[PDB]
Each structure stands twice: as C-alpha cells, then as structure tokens.
C-alpha cells in the first residue's frame, strides 16, 4: 500500500494492476521476480494480493526475455526451462497467448494448475560462476 | 595566432652549409626582433644568434662566430640563418624565438631585446659522414599467452634521426609509449613504440602504427596482431 | 581484508577496484555489464558526482591499474534512505559510461533472491584491497578470506554492537576476530555459495575496528535492497 | 658576462609549492631581466616568466619569479604541483652582446611506488629472414626509475649485448616506461631455446621473469 520515493499510500488492489497509481512508479515496476536457488519465475497478483509461480504453459523465450526487461536486465538474457514447484505454491499464474502489447505481468491470469504440470525457471544473466 | 614555423634542417656533411629559414605568421614581423636558439640531443637551450626588427643590428655566440650570418626578410616575414663551416657540435635541434621583451633606450636611440615570448617548433640538423639509411619496421606482437596487453613496433637501423610513430592515424594515444632511440654499434639508430590495450580488445580493434622517416622518404603503417 | 591471502586470476571476477583522482577508494561488485554496488558512505559529497569515479576490473594489483585504462562512471546513486550518521541503508549503484566485456577475469556476481534460505552462520567470502590490518594502508594485492554470517539478535547483543544492527545491516565475520573486512574493502563483497551459484550478500559497510574480538564486520543487507536496485536498473534502460 | 647556475633536479609532490634556483657568476642578478622557459620532454619550450616576475598572457598564477640580492640568484616559484609540470625549466638572462642560459632543472613529481608491468617480445619472423634477432623487453609505468633488467638465454646471463631506453616522467601518472633490446644473429638465436627478461624493482618482491620458447 505505501510507495517509497514518496510517503504515499496506495490501495493494495492498485499494487501491479497495469496502471502507474505511485508517483515513483513503485506500485508497478516490481510486479515480476525470481524466487529461490533455482530461479522459480514468480509473479504479484493484484487479486490474490501474493506471488505465485508462473505457468510452463505456452511459455518461451519472447516471454522470458520480456520478464528480464520488466526486471530491469534490458537485453540480457541467460537460460529457461521448467521445473516442478520447490517453492511449495498452490496457486499458479497462465499466460494468456491474446493478451496484446501489455507488461508481463498482466499477460497472466490465475489457474489452480497448470496444462504442462511444470514452472517457469528463468535466469536473465550468466552470473555467479568463477575460475 | 601568432606561429613560427622552421623548415630546412637536414643531414649535412662536416665542412659543409645548410640555411634555415622560419616563417612568421600572426603578427607584424618588422615590429620584434627575432632569435635563433639550438638544442643539442640531451643538452641545454644555447643561443646561436639574434637580429634587431629591421635587420641593422645582429649578435652572435662565439661558437658561431665566423661561421654562421643570421638575416631576415621583412617583406616575406622569414627569418634565416646561414650556416658554413659545419661541424658535429653543431647538431642540434634549432628553434626559431620572436625576441618580443625589449625596450627603448632615450640615450643610445634604440630598442634593446633581451627575452623570447614565442618559440618556434624546431628544426634537427645532423652534421655527420654517416649516409642516409631508411629503416625496417618490425611488430612487438602481444604474446596470445590477463587484462592488459602489450604490442607495438621496432623501427630499426635507420640514419638520421628523426622517426615519429603514430598509432591508429592519431585516433589512439592513451597508452602510448614511444622511447628514445638508440644509436647501436653500427651507427644507425633503432627505436620501439609501445601501446597497452585491453586483451579484450586484441580479436575486435586494429592497430596500426603509422611510421615516418623523412630524411629517406620512409612511410609505413604496419599493423600488428597477436 | 585482515586474515585472509591473496586472490588468484579469476577468482573473484565481480570484484572492482573504486579510483579517485588516480587512487583506490573503494571496492565494489559488478551485477550486469554497466552496473556495479558499492556502498553508499564511499560516495558522500563531494564523492557523489560521477566524474570523479573509475573503475578497475579483472586486475589484482593496484600498480597495473593505469590512469586512463579504468572504465568512466557515468551515474551514481546512493539509496535515499541512507544515513551517513547511523550508516541505514548503506548502498549505492554506480553505473559505467561504457559497458564491460565478460571473460575470464570479469563476470558478474548474481543477486540474491527471496527465499534463499542461507544458513543462520552461513559460510561466506569477503574480498578487497582494504588493509591487512587495522589502521594499515591500502593492500597492493586483491585479497580474500572466509567468514561466517553472525545472526542479528546474536550480533545485537550488549557485547557485541548492542542493539545498532538494523534489518538493513547484517554481520559477517568472527566473534573472535582476527579475519575481518578493513579501511579500503568498503563498498565490496560478500558472497556466498549455493546451488552452485555465487550471491551478494552484502557490501562492506562498516565497523569498530577491524579483526577485534567482538567486534565483527557490518555489511549492507542486499537482500533487502533487490528491489530498489532493480527499479534504478530498469529506469535507466529507459533511456 | 657570466654564467647561470641551477641545480640538476628538483622533487615535489602534487599540490605542494617548488622553488628552482637560478644563481649568477658574476655581477648582480638585479642587473639584467631574468626569463624562465619550461621544456616538457620532446617539445619546443614555452616562456613561463619575463622579467624577473611578470607571467605571459595565459600562465596560471601558480607560477611565480622573483630575484634575491644577498644570494644573487633568481627564483621560479610553482605553487599547487601539477602532474603536467613535469619537465625541464631553464633560467635566461643576457650581458651587452650575449643570451645566456642556466643549465636546466628537471623537475620531477614524487608518487608513491609503482610496480613496473613486464613484457617479452620474440623477434619477428619477419626481421629473422635478414639475419638479425631482435629480443624486446617492456617495463610499462613503473616509479621510481631506478630498475633492472637482466637478459638470460637458456639460464645463461647475458652481458654486451643488450641496450635500454627509459621514457620522461608521464605526464598523467609520473610514472617512467623502460625498453631493453637484446641482440643476437639469427644463427645464434636458434642455437638455444629458453629467451628470459628478468626485472628487479622497489615495487616487486621477488625478480619477475618473463620469458618464451623460441619455436613454441
Ligand atoms: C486474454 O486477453 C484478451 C485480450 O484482452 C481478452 O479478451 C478480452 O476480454 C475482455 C473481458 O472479457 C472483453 O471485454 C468485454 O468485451 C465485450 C465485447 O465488446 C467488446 O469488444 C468490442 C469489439 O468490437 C468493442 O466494440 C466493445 O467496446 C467491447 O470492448 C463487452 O460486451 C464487455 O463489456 C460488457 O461486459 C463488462 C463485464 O464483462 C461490463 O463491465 C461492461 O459494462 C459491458 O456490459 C467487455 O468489454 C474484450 O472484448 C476481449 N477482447 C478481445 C480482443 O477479445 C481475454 O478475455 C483474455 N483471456 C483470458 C482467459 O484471460
Ligand atoms: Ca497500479
């Protein structure tokens, strides 16, 4: 509810809802994130007001490239796959393939499973290896 | 904007002549005395000679006494220096200077200069047997075996000084080291110019050095790779 | 860094050496290409303008760093709730006028995630120029050593730094001392290895002293800063 | 006449103020205008002070000339060091007839010790075909100036043999660059095989030894 670059507050419905309700922009631009050791891409649903992993379901690279643009990467783009959820989820977000030119996140709707029974991991860089 | 521009420095024989010339721009050349200066290689500044703004007065170094006539040519804004009777001491690097800190004496009814403002880009005369020799330019190429790398070129066995090296037609200087020469054993001079550059850069950027022997019309851009 | 022993090519790829008029001031992590963290007390004013940055990547002794050859910062940002007294929120970004190239001296350190699930005394590294001992000089080598995540209630404690670790902050190091971070590896890793995956942890932030008994070494909790990062990285790729 | 002495060198560090002596044989130095020229290495001089203490047109006013009676020597002053002063500056006065210099003094930056960046050098194939080998070694911004290059061929020293080169102070950094060539004929060059530069340093610990094998 509360935006940070200011001491505004917000409605939590207004919290990733495709429309910029925070003068910094905060309630909009950290709707999509990679939880865990294993990258499980998840996503903030502005109904259930909770992150929830994201659908293997028609998903591709023209997806996860645009979910590392939404997170700020630009054009970085590392690897995908799916996986089974670790992240102990119950509920799931499916893309929707019509959804048109808006953000990630609102290409997503929610679905008690998903067709492809797997969750998209999704790594936007090669980081953390050495030697 | 004001320049002074020298030109007829050479390789000369010992007992032989050579003149000078330098090329004023940029202000009234008759309004300032003028003044030639000379560096030996590694040496000090020593004053060879000067002459007053319209040419009636001239003084001259006792090294030079006898032997060199300074002169000018008010209507074509030059300043000369003859030279006769060369010899090896005389090789140096010779400056053109605009003698513009004077002043007026009431007593003996003339200026009295006695300090350079402006300073010429120099001419290297070379007084010496020693023939003319163009050199062979050689690539110091990077060792394939972090971070930064190393190349450049030898320009080696040439006669007489100078060379200039340029990297990339002037495009890259930063890193840029090009050393003094060397007079080897058999006389000619040989000497290296060096740049680091990032190994990342080594498979992506050219790299040219762009050598320059006047004396033997010697022109060359060697490109060098690991 | 006090206690540990130098670092071998490649072994910390992310680490950056922080130059001010031609000296190193502080260390930093390389995230993406254009994008480094260092800490926000290295760029205090008149630190704060971009100018007066390099940076120094995939070389470990100062002496090789060549005025001229450090990457030119062209942004700097601290975190706007940062306190310069208290040392809250002790972050900053610091963004190059022009990308790096990735090899295998250089690569970036990835950002942690929720739900990492680190162990309480988690195993860790810190890496920096700083001084291999308190009061000392800038080290000439890149060093590194291990230390070990000091839980927060524990590092609250009234012998310890009684009650100055925020939920910003935490602590790394040993309760014994003797391996610590130091004066010049601010702004630098710590790091952490899971699921085969390097993480920044944190960035060195501050500290009594340095490698003394119950006095370990603060760090800037990046975990709780992935948000405010990705917001300034993603404004910027608004061009 | 009379001559004008200066001493060889003079070491400052950045920001601090430096003082160059200028000092005459005989006669006053209050007798004549004293002018001061800076000579950065391989370029033409620039005046930097006329008579005795005024600056041209474009001379920051960190530099300063003055003259002393007692000593009777005259002064350039540079205040606030800067790494791009860093050259040669010569004293200038004149009698009735003659232009008379000082000897120059070469002013140097101090800065802390620097550890000199080696590289070797294999001669070109090329230069090979005339018969000459050329073995290049390159100690790259290093301080103080003061280094050592040791040429060893298959672990034998070497010595006659070799020549050096060593740049000015550098302008941005202070630091000094150093060039060694060692020279052999082709046919001697393929008698052995290990080519090693060894340099010793105040920045470096121990020697650094870069070397190659020839052929590989
Ligand atoms: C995947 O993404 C696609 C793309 O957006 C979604 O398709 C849209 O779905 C919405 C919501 O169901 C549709 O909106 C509804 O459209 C009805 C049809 O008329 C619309 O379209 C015509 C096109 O000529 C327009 O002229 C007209 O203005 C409308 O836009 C409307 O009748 C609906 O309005 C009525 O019902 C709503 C409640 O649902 C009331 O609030 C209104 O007052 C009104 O009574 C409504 O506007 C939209 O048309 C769809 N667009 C397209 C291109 O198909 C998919 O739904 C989505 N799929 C999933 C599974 O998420
Ligand atoms: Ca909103």
């Known amino acids: 509810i509360e935006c940070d670059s200011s001491g505004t507050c917000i409605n939590p419905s207004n919290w990733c809802d495709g429309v910029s309700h925070c003068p910094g922009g905060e309630d909009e631009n950290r709707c999509v994130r990679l939880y865990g050791p294993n990258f499980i891409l998840q996503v903030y649903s502005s109904q259930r007001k909770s992150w929830h992993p994201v659908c293997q379901d028609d998903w591709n690279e023209n997806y996860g490239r645009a979910a590392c643009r939404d997170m700020g990467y630009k054009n970085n783009f590392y690897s995908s796959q799916g996986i089974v959820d670790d992240s102990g989820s119950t509920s799931f977000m499916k893309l929707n393939t019509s959804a048109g030119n808006v953000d990630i996140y609102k290409k997503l709707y929610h679905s008690d499973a998903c067709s492809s029974k797997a969750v998209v991991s999704l790594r936007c860089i090669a980081c953390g290896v050495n030697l | 904007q004001v320049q002074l521009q020298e030109s007829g420095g050479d390789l000369v024989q010992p007992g032989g002549s050579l003149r000078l010339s330098c090329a004023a721009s940029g202000f009234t050349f008759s309004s300032s005395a003028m003044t030639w200066v000379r560096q030996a290689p590694g040496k000090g500044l020593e004053w060879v000679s000067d002459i007053s703004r319209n040419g009636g007065s001239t003084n001259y170094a006792d090294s030079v006494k006898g032997r060199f006539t300074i002169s000018r040519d008010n209507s074509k804004n030059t300043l000369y220096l003859q030279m006769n009777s060369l010899r090896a001491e005389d090789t140096a690097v010779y400056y053109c200077a605009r003698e513009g800190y004077d002043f007026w004496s009431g007593r003996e009814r003339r200026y009295y200069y006695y300090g350079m403002d402006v300073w010429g880009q120099g001419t290297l005369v070379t007084v010496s047997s020693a023939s003319t020799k163009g050199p062979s330019v050689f690539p110091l190429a990077p060792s394939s075996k972090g971070g930064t790398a190393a190349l450049g070129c030898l320009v080696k066995d040439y006669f007489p000084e100078p060379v200039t090296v340029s990297w990339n037609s002037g495009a890259l200087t930063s890193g840029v080291h090009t050393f003094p020469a060397v007079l080897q054993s058999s006389g000619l001079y040989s000497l290296s110019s060096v740049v680091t550059v990032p190994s990342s850069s080594l498979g992506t950027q050219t790299y040219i050095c762009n050598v320059n022997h006047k004396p033997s019309n010697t022109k060359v851009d060697k490109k060098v790779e690991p | 860094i006090v206690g540990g022993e130098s670092a071998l090519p490649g072994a910390w790829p992310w680490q950056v050496s922080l130059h001010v008029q031609n000296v190193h001031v502080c260390g930093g992590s390389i995230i993406t290409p254009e994008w480094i963290v260092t800490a926000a007390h290295c760029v205090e004013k008149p630190l704060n303008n971009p100018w007066h940055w390099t940076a120094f990547a995939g070389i470990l002794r100062q002496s090789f760093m060549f005025y001229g050859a450090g990457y030119q910062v062209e942004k700097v940002i601290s975190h706007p709730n940062y306190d310069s007294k208290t040392k809250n929120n002790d972050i900053a970004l610091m963004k190059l006028q022009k990308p790096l190239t990735f090899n295998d001296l250089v690569k970036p350190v990835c950002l942690p995630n929720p739900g990492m699930m680190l162990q309480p005394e988690q195993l860790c590294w810190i890496s920096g120029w700083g001084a291999t001992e308190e009061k000392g000089k800038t080290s000439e080598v890149l060093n590194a050593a291990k230390v070990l995540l000091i839980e927060t209630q524990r590092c609250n404690s009234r012998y310890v730094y009684d009650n100055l670790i925020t939920p910003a902050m935490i602590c790394a190091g040993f309760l014994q001392g003797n391996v610590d971070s130091c004066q010049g590896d601010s702004g630098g890793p710590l790091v952490t290895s899971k699921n085969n995956i390097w993480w920044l942890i944190g960035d060195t932030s501050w500290g009594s002293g340095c490698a003394k008994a119950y006095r370990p070494g603060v760090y800037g909790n990046v975990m709780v800063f992935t948000d405010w990062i990705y917001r300034q990285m993603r404004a910027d790729g608004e061009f | 006449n009379f001559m004008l002495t200066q001493p060889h060198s003079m070491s400052e560090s950045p920001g601090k103020t430096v003082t160059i002596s200028c000092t005459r044989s005989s006669g006053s130095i209050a007798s004549n205008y004293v002018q001061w020229y800076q000579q950065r290495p391989g370029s033409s001089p620039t005046t930097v002070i006329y008579?005795?203490?005024?600056?041209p047109s474009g001379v920051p006013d960190r530099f300063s000339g003055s003259i002393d009676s007692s000593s009777n020597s005259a002064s350039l002053t540079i205040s606030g060091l800067k790494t791009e002063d860093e050259a040669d500056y010569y004293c200038q006065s004149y009698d009735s007839s003659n232009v008379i210099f000082g000897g120059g003094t070469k002013l140097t930056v101090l800065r802390t010790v620097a550890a000199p960046s080696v590289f070797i050098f294999p001669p070109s194939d090329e230069q090979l075909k005339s018969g000459t080998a050329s073995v290049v070694c390159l100690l790259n911004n290093f301080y103080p100036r003061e280094a050592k290059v040791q040429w060893k061929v298959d672990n034998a020293l070497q010595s006659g043999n070799s020549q050096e080169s060593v740049t000015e102070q550098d302008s941005k950094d202070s630091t000094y660059s150093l060039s060694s060539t060692l020279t052999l004929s082709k046919a001697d060059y393929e008698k052995h095989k290990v080519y090693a530069c060894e340099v010793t340093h105040q920045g470096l610990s121990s020697p650094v030894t870069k070397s190659f094998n020839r052929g590989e």
């Open positions: 008579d005795d203490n005024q600056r």
